[PDB]
């Protein structure tokens, strides 16, 4: 009670007659509001994942993605994408961490070659078709495509490099059709003895087992450079609440106060408003072009009026600078 608060403030068990200042009355916030502009200009991930035709694994398709918002929850929310292996970054924190550029590598492989798309792995795809660096920052996605890439007669439109003089560098594409030199004698462009064409055809069929069905694979290699990163995830926006002391996040700006309608006419470019005392007093909502005053939650100084405790223990409370309707 205020008498005991006064005793605590004065560090004494007896309070003499007079008026004493003890503490402050401040209203506390209850709701937190986070705001960002409309989630528009989506990255064209549909053209990459929902594409009707992919290229071969040796000629893997590379797509650069930037200057858009990338919704990684869409890829996380589709059931058919069974294989989601990611290395060097947590899949849960993909939505928040911002990077400069995206590289989407699309190709087609079989079952036994799915595991070869990983850092430190080896095989025909790793050596001659698609090489992944050891310090790879990104994810890989693989999904079954037996209903699309398989024919009863056979689909011969997909090819893989089976022979090469050396292993591919990371993120290197080899499309050369030069005859592989397997023997001492020069090939001279003829695939005769000890001379084989480096590319073989994947004869996908709908009657193959899980180890031989065609599987579409898209690899997202994510890079951050010295330039300002422009690939962001979708930023969730909390619904607006007004007329109450609330915590607000406006475009990364923290604050705590009552949001009220304002009569100020901000210029179209103008974003933040400051008062005489160099403090933020007005803000423009990032979604709806409206102005809002930010008033501090009710402030009061509490003073206690009491006679000497030798006389009586009754007290009175004076709230300084506070109207009687705000208590």
């Amino acid at each position, epitope marked *: 009670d205020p008498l005991s608060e006064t005793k605590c403030t004065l560090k004494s068990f007896t309070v003499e007659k007079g008026i004493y200042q003890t503490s402050n009355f401040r209203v506390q916030p209850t709701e937190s509001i986070v705001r960002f502009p409309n989630i528009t200009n989506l990255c064209p991930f549909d053209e990459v994942f929902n594409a*009707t*035709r992919f290229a071969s694994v040796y000629a893997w398709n590379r797509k650069r993605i930037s200057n858009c918002v990338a919704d990684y929850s869409v890829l996380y929310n589709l059931a*058919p994408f069974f294989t989601f292996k990611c290395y060097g970054v947590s899949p849960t924190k993909l939505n928040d961490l911002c990077f400069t550029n995206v590289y989407a590598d699309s190709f087609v492989i079989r079952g036994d070659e799915v595991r070869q798309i990983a850092p430190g792995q080896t095989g025909n795809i790793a050596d001659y078709n698609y090489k992944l660096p050891d310090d790879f920052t990104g994810c890989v996605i693989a999904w079954n495509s*037996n*209903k*699309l890439d398989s*024919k009863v*007669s056979g689909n011969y439109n997909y090819l893989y490099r089976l022979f090469r003089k050396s292993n591919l560098k990371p993120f290197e594409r080899d499309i050369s059709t030069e005859i592989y030199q397997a023997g001492n004698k020069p090939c001279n462009g003829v695939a005769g003895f000890n001379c084989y064409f480096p590319l073989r055809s994947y004869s996908f069929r709908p009657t193959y087992g899980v180890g031989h069905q065609p599987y579409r694979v898209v690899v997202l290699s994510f890079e951050l450079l010295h330039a300002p990163a422009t690939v962001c995830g979708p930023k969730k926006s909390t619904n607006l609440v007004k007329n109450k002391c609330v915590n607000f996040n406006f475009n990364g700006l923290k604050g705590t106060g009552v949001l009220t309608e304002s009569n100020k006419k901000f210029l179209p470019f103008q974003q933040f408003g400051r008062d005489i005392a160099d403090t933020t007093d007005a803000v423009r909502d990032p979604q709806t072009l409206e102005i809002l005053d930010i008033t501090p939650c009710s402030f009061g100084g509490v003073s206690v009026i009491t006679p000497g405790t030798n006389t009586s223990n009754q007290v009175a409370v004076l709230y300084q600078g506070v109207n009687c309707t705000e208590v």
Partner: antibody
Amino acid sequence: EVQLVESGGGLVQPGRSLRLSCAASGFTFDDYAMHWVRQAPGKGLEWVSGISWNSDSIDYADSVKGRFTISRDNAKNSLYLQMNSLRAEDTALYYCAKDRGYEILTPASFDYWGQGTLVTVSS
Amino acid sequence: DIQMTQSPSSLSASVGDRVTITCRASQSISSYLNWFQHKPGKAPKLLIYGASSLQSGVPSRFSGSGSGTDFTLTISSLQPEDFATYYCQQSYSTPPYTFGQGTKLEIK
């Protein structure tokens, strides 16, 4: 929401020839497979023919082998079917369905269909 | 070759009932079957592609299931705009895109 408009239907005598045209405008036609199927006036659906995105792989129904031919014009986003050596059993309804995939023989089936056109083969 | 059979041909139900249709195959097709709804007044439309994949844009009331030889489609709500014929088509065997017999559905 895609549009599939079919024409060329009518009544012809047995043994004559005609053309059916199916035009699409609501989607990209350069990378989709297309099919012609037959619904009898008193029976169920039956596949007839189909073409892939490019005129490389082509297939026909066994009962119509050596009689019907198909063509595809990607410039105007449409396809044509030539009706030759018609007999009494070709008086059914014909649809122009769009395959989900790009090849001719894939487990993926027809995605979007169009209103059938009525043809009659009688004197 | 491949043979497809439709156990039901014509069925009777009401608005607030539950109906089930089955399609059987002579040989297993690795669950590569598709269901088509054919209104008598307009062009037929697909409802279920594959074993148990629902085509986006149709109500989730229809449910496809079953693998191997016998497959099943199920309607739980029976809206009064479901007057059509249901076909099952296989896309795995050598006969290309062979369709089954019709299945009349009506309410009484």
